[PDB]
């Protein structure tokens, strides 16, 4: 369900458009797809909001070009989605890499369509270590991760899964999650990892004016909690909500608090 | 600099890469080659800019494969030129079909390496008439050119030269220009005429963000001046300079004005 939207360069981008009312645009993490928000999606539809789930180029049911995995190109894709569908008063949720893409979209295309921003487990302002930012993976760790993905992607994914959740979810649940990532294009997966390693949004954060909720797991081993402290420090007017029991995947480790918090924010 | 760039399909693309300091990438019209810009190039070089004149596949000193004359593949070749020569801050000029390719390149590969766009007599947004675009050759007029190239290409060309310039230029100048086109591969010339006939960039014009200058001859019989009006309305912030005394070939009809407008814009947007 849901149409495909053409990107500026013609790539077909799959968008799931379901429910009634004010729009909630959810942007997935690396290297999954929009189905990761299934539980939130259900909860939106019964509270009377409209879920808009995009699969990035290279992921899920979208096309997978050889190019365009940098945040600029991805943010232009989001811009096209918002344009075709004529969305205003958007609650824009970016999860992990999606948080980076959401920030890039605001920076490059403006803030007037978005009434509020939610940054969840966001890979922002940087996924990797920088001067004055001694948190997260180093570029060299991301390169080792790229090496692994060129040797055995499924085993890389298994490993990533192991550090993604603080809690031990049932096997069928972990398997469903694993398979979102396995159906990603291998080359999209790789080029996005290159973008995660290199992208730096530190100069842009103090430029952000949208009302902002930051959701982040204290135990996050993928994007450390220190990222969330930096986002809150740098975005004026922002609120930090700490998920004390969660790792990166707060949408399962604390599914009810995550979705009640999302719902309460989209109302308020 | 030198020689040849590898396209995605391996086709070798000739590039005349000359000078140092800021790059001005010049994209020729159908069915000539980068040498048509010589009068402009002379001035860019004395003003201390770097001339990057691409010969498309099928033209000039480039390989002429069987396929890939569609603007998508051509725009991909331009991406290769810029990426492999590691250019940024480029002024990108497209003349005629070059105009169309320049736009497609911006749409398909983004604007991060390009500081400004010049569209000179451009074949855009469409070279042939459509639904609510009642300007230019019809599709059947371009089929007529294609048919003629399949029987007598130099005669086809002499005929095209006659509709190319508003003024009668000296016999040796016209012969020079003619011979630039006779050098073209016959089969590239045909395949690019098919892309001219069929390509349609109307949807894409409002996606262009880069600073644009439109240069166009009031008397152009090849790409009618109405194309320029359409481009100016739809490309954000574009400026329009009308060449009152020029046909399609402004680069000779108003040589001095064309060159010194181009130079000024390369100097500042």
Numbering used by the authors:
A (entry chain A): 1 to 268
B (entry chain B): 1 to 269
Sentences from the paper on this structure:
In this study, we report on the detailed structural and biochemical characteristics of an esterase (EaEST) from a psychrophilic bacterium Exiguobacterium antarcticum B7. The crystal structure of peracetate-bound EaEST was resolved at high resolution, revealing that EaEST retains the characteristic α/β-hydrolase fold with a cap domain and has a catalytic triad of Ser96, Asp220, and His248. Using an analytical ultracentrifugation (AUC) analysis, we also confirmed that the purified EaEST protein forms a stable trimer in solution. These studies provide insight into an unusual enzymatic feature, the dual catalytic role of EaEST as a typical esterase and perhydrolase. The results of analytical ultracentrifugation demonstrated that the purified EaEST protein is a stable trimer in solution.
The crystal structure of an esterase (EaEST) from Exiguobacterium antarcticum was determined in a P3 space group. The final model was refined up to 1.9 Å and produced Rwork and Rfree values of 0.185 and 0.235, respectively. The asymmetric unit of an EaEST crystal contains two protomers. During the process of structure determination, unknown electron-density maps were found near the active sites of both molecules in the asymmetric unit. Even if no specific ligands were added to EaEST at purification and crystallization, the unknown electron density was initially interpreted as an acetate because of crystallization conditions containing 0.2 M ammonium acetate. After building and refining the model, additional electron density was clearly observed in the hydroxyl group of acetic acid, indicating that EaEST has perhydrolysis activity via acetic acid. Using repetitive refinement, the peracetate molecule was perfectly fitted into the electron-density map. The hydroxyl group of peracetic acid forms hydrogen bonds with the O atom of Ser96, the NE2 atom of His248, and main-chain oxygen atom of Trp30. The active site of EaEST is comprised of a conserved catalytic triad (Ser96, Asp220, and His248) and the neighboring hydrophobic pocket, which is composed of the hydrophobic residues Trp30, Phe127, Met137, Leu145, Met156, Phe160, Ile163, Leu199, Phe164, and Val 222. The crystal structure of EaEST in peracetate-bound form provides the first structural insights into the final product-bound state during perhydrolysis.
